[PDB]
Design a protein around this nucleic acid. Sequence first.
RNA 1: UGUUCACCCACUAAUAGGGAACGUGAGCUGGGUUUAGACCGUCGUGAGACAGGUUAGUUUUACCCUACUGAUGAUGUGUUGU
RNA 2: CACGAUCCUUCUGACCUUUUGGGUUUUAAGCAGGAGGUGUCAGAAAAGUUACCACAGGGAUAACUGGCUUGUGGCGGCCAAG
RNA 3: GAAUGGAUGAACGAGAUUCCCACUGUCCCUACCUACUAUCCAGCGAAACCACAGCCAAGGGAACGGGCUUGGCGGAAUCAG
RNA 4: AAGCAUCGCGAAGGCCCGCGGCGGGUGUUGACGCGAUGUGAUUUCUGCCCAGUGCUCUGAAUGUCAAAGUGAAGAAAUUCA
RNA 5: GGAGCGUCGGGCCCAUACCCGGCCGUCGCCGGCAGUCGAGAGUGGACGGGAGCGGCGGGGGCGGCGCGCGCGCGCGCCCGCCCCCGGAGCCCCGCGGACGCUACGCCGCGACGAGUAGGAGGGCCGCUGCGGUGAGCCUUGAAGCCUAGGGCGCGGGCCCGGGUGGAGCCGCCGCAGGUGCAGAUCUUGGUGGUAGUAGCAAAUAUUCAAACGAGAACUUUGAAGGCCGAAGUGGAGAAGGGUU
RNA 6: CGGCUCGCUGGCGUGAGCCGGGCGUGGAAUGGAGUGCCUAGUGGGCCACUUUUGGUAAGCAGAACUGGCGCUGCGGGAUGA
RNA 7: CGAAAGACUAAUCGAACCAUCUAGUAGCUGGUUCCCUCCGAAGUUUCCCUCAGGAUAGCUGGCGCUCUCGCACACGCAGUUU
RNA 8: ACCCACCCGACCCGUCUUGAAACACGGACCAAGGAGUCUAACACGUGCGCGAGUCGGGGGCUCGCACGAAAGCCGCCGUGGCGCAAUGAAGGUGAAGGCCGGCGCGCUCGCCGGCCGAGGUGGGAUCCCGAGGCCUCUCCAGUCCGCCGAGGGCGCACCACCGGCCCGUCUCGCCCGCCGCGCCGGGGAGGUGGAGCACGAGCGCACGUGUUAGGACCCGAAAGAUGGUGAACUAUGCCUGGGC
RNA 9: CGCGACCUCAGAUCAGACGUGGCGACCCGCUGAAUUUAAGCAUAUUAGUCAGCGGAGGAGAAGAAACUAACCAGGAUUCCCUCAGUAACGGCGAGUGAACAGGGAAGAGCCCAGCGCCGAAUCCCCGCCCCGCGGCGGGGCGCGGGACAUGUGGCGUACGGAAGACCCGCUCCCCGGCGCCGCUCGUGGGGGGCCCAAGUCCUUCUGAUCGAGGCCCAGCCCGUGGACGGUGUGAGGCCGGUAGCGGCCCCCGGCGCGCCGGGCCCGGGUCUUCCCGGAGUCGGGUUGCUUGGGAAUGCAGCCCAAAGCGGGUGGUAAACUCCAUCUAAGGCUAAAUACCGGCACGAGACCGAUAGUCAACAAGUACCGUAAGGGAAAGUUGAAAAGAACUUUGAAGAGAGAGUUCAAGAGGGCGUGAAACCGUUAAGAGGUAAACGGGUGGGGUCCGCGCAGUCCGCCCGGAGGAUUCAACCCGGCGGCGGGUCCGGCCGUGUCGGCGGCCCGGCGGAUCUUUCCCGCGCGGGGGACCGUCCCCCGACCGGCGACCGGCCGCCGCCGGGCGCAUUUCCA
Lengths: 147, 210
Amino acid sequence: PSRLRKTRKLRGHVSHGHGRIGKHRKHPGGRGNAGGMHHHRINFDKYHPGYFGKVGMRHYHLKRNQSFCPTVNLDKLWTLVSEQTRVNAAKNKTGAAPIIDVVRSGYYKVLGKGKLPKQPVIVKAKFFSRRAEEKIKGVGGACVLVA
Amino acid sequence: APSRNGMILKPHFHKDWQRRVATWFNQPARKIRRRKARQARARRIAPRPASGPLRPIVRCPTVRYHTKVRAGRGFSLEELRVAGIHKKVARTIGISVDPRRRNKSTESLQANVQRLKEYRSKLVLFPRKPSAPKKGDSSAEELKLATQLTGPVMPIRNVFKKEKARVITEEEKNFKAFASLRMARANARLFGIRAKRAKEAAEQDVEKKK
RNA sequence: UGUUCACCCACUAAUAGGGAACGUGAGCUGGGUUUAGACCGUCGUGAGACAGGUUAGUUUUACCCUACUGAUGAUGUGUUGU
RNA sequence: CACGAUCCUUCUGACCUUUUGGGUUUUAAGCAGGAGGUGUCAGAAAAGUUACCACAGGGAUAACUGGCUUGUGGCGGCCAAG
RNA sequence: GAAUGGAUGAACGAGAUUCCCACUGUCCCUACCUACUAUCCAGCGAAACCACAGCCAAGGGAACGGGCUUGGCGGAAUCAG
RNA sequence: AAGCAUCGCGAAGGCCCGCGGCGGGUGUUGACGCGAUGUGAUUUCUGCCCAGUGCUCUGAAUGUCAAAGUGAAGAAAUUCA
RNA sequence: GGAGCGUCGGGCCCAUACCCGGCCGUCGCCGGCAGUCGAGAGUGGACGGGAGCGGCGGGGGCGGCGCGCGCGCGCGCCCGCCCCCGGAGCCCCGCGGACGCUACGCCGCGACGAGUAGGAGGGCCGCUGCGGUGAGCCUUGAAGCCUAGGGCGCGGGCCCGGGUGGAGCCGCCGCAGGUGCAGAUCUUGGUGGUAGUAGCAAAUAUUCAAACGAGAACUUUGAAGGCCGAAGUGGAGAAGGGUU
RNA sequence: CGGCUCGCUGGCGUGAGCCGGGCGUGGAAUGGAGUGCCUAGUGGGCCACUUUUGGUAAGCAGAACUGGCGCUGCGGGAUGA
RNA sequence: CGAAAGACUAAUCGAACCAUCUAGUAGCUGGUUCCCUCCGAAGUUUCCCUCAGGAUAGCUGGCGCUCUCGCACACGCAGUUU
RNA sequence: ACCCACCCGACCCGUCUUGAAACACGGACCAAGGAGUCUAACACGUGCGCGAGUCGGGGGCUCGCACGAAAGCCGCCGUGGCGCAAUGAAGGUGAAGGCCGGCGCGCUCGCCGGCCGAGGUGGGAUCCCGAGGCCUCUCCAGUCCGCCGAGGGCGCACCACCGGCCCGUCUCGCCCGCCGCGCCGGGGAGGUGGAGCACGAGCGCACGUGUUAGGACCCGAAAGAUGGUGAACUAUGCCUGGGC
RNA sequence: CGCGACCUCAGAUCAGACGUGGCGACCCGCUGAAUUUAAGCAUAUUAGUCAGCGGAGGAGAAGAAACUAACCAGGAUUCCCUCAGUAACGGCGAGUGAACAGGGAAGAGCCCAGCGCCGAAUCCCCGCCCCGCGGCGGGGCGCGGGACAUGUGGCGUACGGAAGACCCGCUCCCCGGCGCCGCUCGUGGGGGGCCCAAGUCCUUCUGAUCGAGGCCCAGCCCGUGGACGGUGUGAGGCCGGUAGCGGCCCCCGGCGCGCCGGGCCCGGGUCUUCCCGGAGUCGGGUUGCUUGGGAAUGCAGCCCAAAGCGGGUGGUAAACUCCAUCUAAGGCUAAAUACCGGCACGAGACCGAUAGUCAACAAGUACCGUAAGGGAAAGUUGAAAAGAACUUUGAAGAGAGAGUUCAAGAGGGCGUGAAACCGUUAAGAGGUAAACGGGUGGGGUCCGCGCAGUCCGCCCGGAGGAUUCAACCCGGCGGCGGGUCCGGCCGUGUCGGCGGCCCGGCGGAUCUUUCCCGCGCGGGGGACCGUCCCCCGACCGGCGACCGGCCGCCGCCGGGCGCAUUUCCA
Ligand SMILES: [Mg+2]
Ligand SMILES: [Mg+2]
Ligand SMILES: [Mg+2]
Ligand SMILES: [Mg+2]
Ligand SMILES: [Mg+2]
Ligand SMILES: [Mg+2]
Ligand SMILES: [Mg+2]
Ligand SMILES: [Mg+2]
Ligand SMILES: [Mg+2]
Ligand SMILES: [Mg+2]
Ligand SMILES: [Mg+2]
Ligand SMILES: [Mg+2]
Ligand SMILES: [Mg+2]
Ligand SMILES: [Mg+2]
Ligand SMILES: [Mg+2]
Ligand SMILES: [Mg+2]
Ligand SMILES: [Mg+2]
Ligand SMILES: [Mg+2]
Ligand SMILES: [Mg+2]
Ligand SMILES: [Mg+2]
Ligand SMILES: [Mg+2]
Ligand SMILES: [Mg+2]
Ligand SMILES: [Mg+2]
Ligand SMILES: [Mg+2]
Ligand SMILES: [Mg+2]
Ligand SMILES: [Mg+2]
Ligand SMILES: [Mg+2]
Ligand SMILES: [Mg+2]
Ligand SMILES: [Mg+2]
Ligand SMILES: [Mg+2]
Ligand SMILES: [Mg+2]
Ligand SMILES: [Mg+2]
Ligand SMILES: [Mg+2]
Ligand SMILES: [Mg+2]
Ligand SMILES: [Mg+2]
Ligand SMILES: [Mg+2]
Ligand SMILES: [Mg+2]
Ligand SMILES: [Mg+2]
Ligand SMILES: [Mg+2]
Ligand SMILES: [Mg+2]
Ligand SMILES: [Mg+2]
Ligand SMILES: [Mg+2]
Ligand SMILES: [Mg+2]
Ligand SMILES: [Mg+2]
Ligand SMILES: [Mg+2]
Ligand SMILES: [Mg+2]
Ligand SMILES: [Mg+2]
Ligand SMILES: [Mg+2]
Ligand SMILES: [Mg+2]
Ligand SMILES: [Mg+2]
Ligand SMILES: [Mg+2]
Ligand SMILES: [Mg+2]
Ligand SMILES: [Mg+2]
Ligand SMILES: [Mg+2]
Ligand SMILES: [Mg+2]
Ligand SMILES: [Mg+2]
Ligand SMILES: [Mg+2]
Ligand SMILES: [Mg+2]
Ligand SMILES: [Mg+2]
Ligand SMILES: [Mg+2]
Ligand SMILES: [Mg+2]
Ligand SMILES: [Mg+2]
Ligand SMILES: [Mg+2]
Ligand SMILES: [Mg+2]
Ligand SMILES: [Mg+2]
Ligand SMILES: [Mg+2]
Ligand SMILES: [Mg+2]
Ligand SMILES: [Mg+2]
Ligand SMILES: [Mg+2]
Ligand SMILES: [Mg+2]
Ligand SMILES: [Mg+2]
Ligand SMILES: [Mg+2]
Ligand SMILES: [Mg+2]
Ligand SMILES: [Mg+2]
Ligand SMILES: [Mg+2]
């Protein structure tokens, strides 16, 4: 919508909002990220601390899927399963504890943020945190490694 | 020139890109054309599935996909050999065959034999002439269907086995997972040197004798 | 002497001093400065340099407005002439 | 006051990390601290000439006039030792 | 200052100087004449240039005004210069 | 410009072209010639300077001087000779 | 005998400054109004017993918190009532509520208003096309054009009258953009002043009569006077032209 | 005021940090405050009072301080940043 | 190509002309289209092969939010003074 | 609003500039044309939908498309993107604490049972409780309705401060674990680096402004590069003719 | 010095074939800048991009792993989405920059050399006959030529293959013709032709209407047709079309059946014995280019130069070592993909004659340039030419009358006809260039009046005329509002029915395989939970969600009411 834009309101005025002392010349700074070291340095090193320089190790044929390891927190572990597993449990009276295959739901690691409700579980997962393990045991459950 | 905060960003419009802009005003016209051509091909292969041939079940590669299962390119030779379909014939009954597939584990093999067996059950081979010889099915299962199969033939559905609620034996509860993982990491790490030091120590024991 | 300036001869009453975009190039002239051609000296490895010398080198337009010069006329006095 | 970023090099440091299908060893690559310098000292790697010259501009800036000033030049007082 | 050539030198030069004789309007010092113009007329008929325009003195002013301030003043339309 | 004076070359050569060729120009040529520079008819001269920058001559007597090749140690990349 | 200079009076002169008033806009007000009492607000109302001229017998405070338009009252007759706006008649009305209320509306009080570069808001300002919508307009005259006609708007602009014209065009709500010019030694086209001006001056030269003809300075014929003066203004080619 | 905490400090004590109570206008004048995001133009300046450096001085060059002009009309200063 | 003047090479030569790369780049000239309303600057900072430009502070606008109470019942802030 | 008169006022615009009526440039006049665009990427603001999710592409199913190259639908609804977790160069690791009771010597360390469950200080719009008024036509009783409300509380968001947790790192220390007792693995205390956590705010769509890359507001070089055309002029050589 | 084989080479206007140039949007192979960015510049970038050369096809190229990976593993090529502005490169600056996996579009796989077996079992050309002949083919017959053992053809190629013995089960696939049947998706494939609904109805405007009003239901008639165009304005019905699984005729394709001519004796498993791979290539060194590819991603030249349990890859140089993974140095292959050139169509929130292509027109034209090349301007009378007969002035161009046209105030460069600028006509002014702002005056032009503008409207009082009613009941209709929620429909929250629950379905990682069906899994039942529906009673919000009676009120029509009422008029 040109109708709404600013150039409609600038019609009539000479400079078109670019001033008349200094003008709208083509590329007064240099094109683009020109002068990162010289003559634009201050902007670079007060809004991009650490642009310039190497750091760390190269890694040639990176393939991301090798390092694939999506995490989930205890916080919302019960979310993976239907409420009626968490309900048929705190009930039942066998002391059963329902299984939660986390790898089925698409998380490999189980990290340990959050309060887990006092209600036993069997968490199957590829990897665990230390704390996530501990919390799980404290609920009265069992962590289970899977390949 | 940059002005107070923003991504120091690199656009790739320095070559003559407007010479190679590729618009998509086709796409509707395209989508139709494919669709017509699709419906034509069905009609040509008259009672044969529109899909194509039947294709194997197959697991993806890499740790990432790993858990999922797709359709593969074609059934291996072992899978045809065990099912008892002559490879040259299998092409003629709508069974995809690749021959470059290895077959590592017997769980993936027996599944894919089972597939072909099931296919052969629910297949309606018409006889060559209207006069009916062996193999060719009855005119009952022929009149009741010279019907095409819409969609992929015997589709693969990645499926899960429901685990019932156990009781947690004092042993599961005993397990120290995180520790176990740390241990298992370090033993892979240190396997190799440990073996070299033991090889050193064995040489020192033998060197003591001489 | 391109000179401004300078000096000398002569006359004279006297050979005072200045200004006008250092009056005055669609007024001239173009000798000199100050393109390009060339020579010499000094300087520069060199291309080249030199308020160092030399020689050769295109000086456009007015019919507009004004100003000035002269030329017909103009309003008035009824018209005309004296 | 007496000093120097990124990149690169070099040395020192840990039973350190990586060197990619796995293992051992050399090698290399990282991590951390010093050194090798940028004096145009917040840090290009860099000789002239053009009178054969060009282009973008500048009265932000020279070479005339004209303004301001009058040191300097020119001209004129006052005092009065001579 | 010596083949970055030195010194010379008859002949030659639309080459650079200086003097003398002759000759002359170069000048003292200007004048008269001729032809073609310019001029007036018939016919024909362009261009550059052009903010608006077009009388001065002084003032101030981006420090030399046609326009501003204060004074002088101002009379159609034109011709040749 | 004639005149003078240097310099290179005896042809698998001097000088030069060409993108390339058992290519081409000088050259249908051979030092009284081809090629490269200066000075500039004649006359008369043409001093000294080989430190500098050039050019050139010699070359196991010899400092440095690359790739290959030779040896060396190393498991090898290699390093050193 | 100032229209000079120094010291001082009264008086008068006028800026867009100051004061009062009008009108426009902006800002602010916990602004007001979806329908109610109420102007330093400092209550209103059940309802029960006991009673009545009683009351709440508190500061030269000069007073606000308490008093003289009634509390009980006139009527029905010491007892009853002290009644209902579909009717008190109203300055307040709690029974229902604008002429007003497109709540992006309407209304009230104050204050304030220079502006380049620049920023933002609003434009029932303007251009062209699209979805909607105006039972829109139009040969009984669309667009455009022109107008010493009538008006509106602060303005961008707009609307009507008349003329001209001869086929299409507009209002509103949305969307869209190749959307508004005085300048760019801007581009393309057109037109002036300059101007009936400069100019139609290289190479000696024309004159008389006639013919044709609407018409003769210039054609043609005749006569005269002139020039080129065989290195020609003569007589023939080459190239080039291409029907001259 | 009352009490707790300390791995600090130390003859005992410091000093700090915590809880729990108890007390209200603490000079004049004025004014509603705080706070966060996007952000253009600008980065040639000049002038006056006073102060002030260079300079014989300048409508010269250079600082300070405030206020101007620039961005700004209006009355006065005849004319005028 | 030049008996050398940087001469000449189709009115073009200190590098011809034609088409393209090409809408070449420009810290530099020039221009940059309707109305009202409200707010309204800077020419100073540090850095820059920086000094006719950028960066960065500053100065401007816009959007807000959080609270305050003239609804007899206020805290904080200042180009002052005490 | 057309013309004329008169008094007062009044230099020509545009532009660069500290300064323009300038003896600064551009501009004789009129018409039409004529310059901040579009794409991509980012950021912030705003509007809408859904919300620990969101998403639509790409693909597919529904039609000869009149309107359609639309519209609709999809275990593709989610392959996947962004988001929901960081931190380390990396190997890797990865956001909880409190309290109570018991057992280990409570050793501000190690292990076993119960309860609460995102800490605390100050300020915080707002809610909540509310002594007490303040009247009612009388003396008291007395529920109903307000108005205010001293005093006291829960305290959103947000801010400041102090605690805590996660990753990197250092320093100091003492214990645990077992299929592999090891140059194995795990924890503690105290600092200190992190674009962290501390009951989530994102995703998609749309508009606006700003900043960039692109012809990038419009106009402007001197140059540079590739491939072609010319010696009809002129330069020089050669061939064949002419002339003095 | 003969004749004859072959080998290597010539020549033929020998017989018969092919290749040459073009186009170039897309495609394949080379070649290859510089403007530009970096605020300078040389590496980098621009860019393997423009220009240059080569060669194609309807597509091209690529392609059946010397692949990915490191998994529980995928499995040719191309294309899209994603990966990802990521890993990486880089004066680590500017900047640049992939791949695998994952999801899709599509989907298709094959053949030699070799090693071997088979009397060369093979091929080409001659010549005679039968068919067929506008894509030169079949069949037969020839002591008719030649190619070929320096290797043709069948079997066979790594997914293994061959040959053998017995286990099994049985025998259609192809082409040259000749016919014939069903015209075979935009709903009869492709092409061609020719066809198919309804007003010129009534009035009326007009130069002419396709307009405006009407016409048994917005009017008549068709409507599977109201797209579009044309026709003297604006047309579903005047005409061409448009709609339609509408028609007919041609031709051609494609597929179905029959007959003939040929070819063709074409399997699989099981055990044994044999068989097996492309050299100046890989690989190394190198130099140069190239790449994100980094101690060398790919291509090159030069030098070296292999092997066979080898070789290649396994993204950091090397040695040792295990694993994994392909099988290189020969070849063919549709498809999804591309398409600013061509032929033929369709459309548009585009432009509307200084725009849009250079070009709406006798445009790559005229014109320029030696040449390469450059390159315009330019649309519109009217419905119809009805384009002005004739008279007259003039040598004529030009006029004046006349005429045509609705109009020439449309006259052949003619629709409309702005401005600059000019002519005239009218008015007004005039020595400080004009022009301008503010303020008045004078004159003009028109515009509104008034031949009193005393402007209207309520209510009232009076005097004159005027018809009918208000008021009042009565009968009818319609509307509102109300509570008794009275009676019934209606729906919110709650409770009761466990009643829909199987006569109520979906969802669930809840359960059960006591079930059923199909092969521990899939589908369906069967429990269970969550969610959505029937039955009646009770309480409550009695809600604009409605009905029925009753009430009250209002309004209209019709009755009555004749005149102290009732309106009208002046
Ligand atoms: Mg701006
Ligand atoms: Mg400007
Ligand atoms: Mg700027
Ligand atoms: Mg498919
Ligand atoms: Mg002079
Ligand atoms: Mg003069
Ligand atoms: Mg002159
Ligand atoms: Mg001279
Ligand atoms: Mg000279
Ligand atoms: Mg004259
Ligand atoms: Mg290995
Ligand atoms: Mg010179
Ligand atoms: Mg010079
Ligand atoms: Mg020269
Ligand atoms: Mg100056
Ligand atoms: Mg000398
Ligand atoms: Mg000598
Ligand atoms: Mg000399
Ligand atoms: Mg002037
Ligand atoms: Mg010499
Ligand atoms: Mg020497
Ligand atoms: Mg203002
Ligand atoms: Mg402005
Ligand atoms: Mg018409
Ligand atoms: Mg457009
Ligand atoms: Mg214009
Ligand atoms: Mg004349
Ligand atoms: Mg002749
Ligand atoms: Mg500036
Ligand atoms: Mg300025
Ligand atoms: Mg050049
Ligand atoms: Mg441009
Ligand atoms: Mg600059
Ligand atoms: Mg503001
Ligand atoms: Mg400037
Ligand atoms: Mg200046
Ligand atoms: Mg100006
Ligand atoms: Mg001046
Ligand atoms: Mg200029
Ligand atoms: Mg001019
Ligand atoms: Mg215009
Ligand atoms: Mg947003
Ligand atoms: Mg920004
Ligand atoms: Mg831009
Ligand atoms: Mg240009
Ligand atoms: Mg260059
Ligand atoms: Mg060809
Ligand atoms: Mg550059
Ligand atoms: Mg630049
Ligand atoms: Mg440069
Ligand atoms: Mg490149
Ligand atoms: Mg090309
Ligand atoms: Mg192909
Ligand atoms: Mg291959
Ligand atoms: Mg692949
Ligand atoms: Mg991303
Ligand atoms: Mg690249
Ligand atoms: Mg063979
Ligand atoms: Mg029509
Ligand atoms: Mg029609
Ligand atoms: Mg018809
Ligand atoms: Mg490269
Ligand atoms: Mg490796
Ligand atoms: Mg191929
Ligand atoms: Mg035209
Ligand atoms: Mg036109
Ligand atoms: Mg055109
Ligand atoms: Mg036109
Ligand atoms: Mg026309
Ligand atoms: Mg026209
Ligand atoms: Mg007409
Ligand atoms: Mg007309
Ligand atoms: Mg006309
Ligand atoms: Mg027309
Ligand atoms: Mg007159």
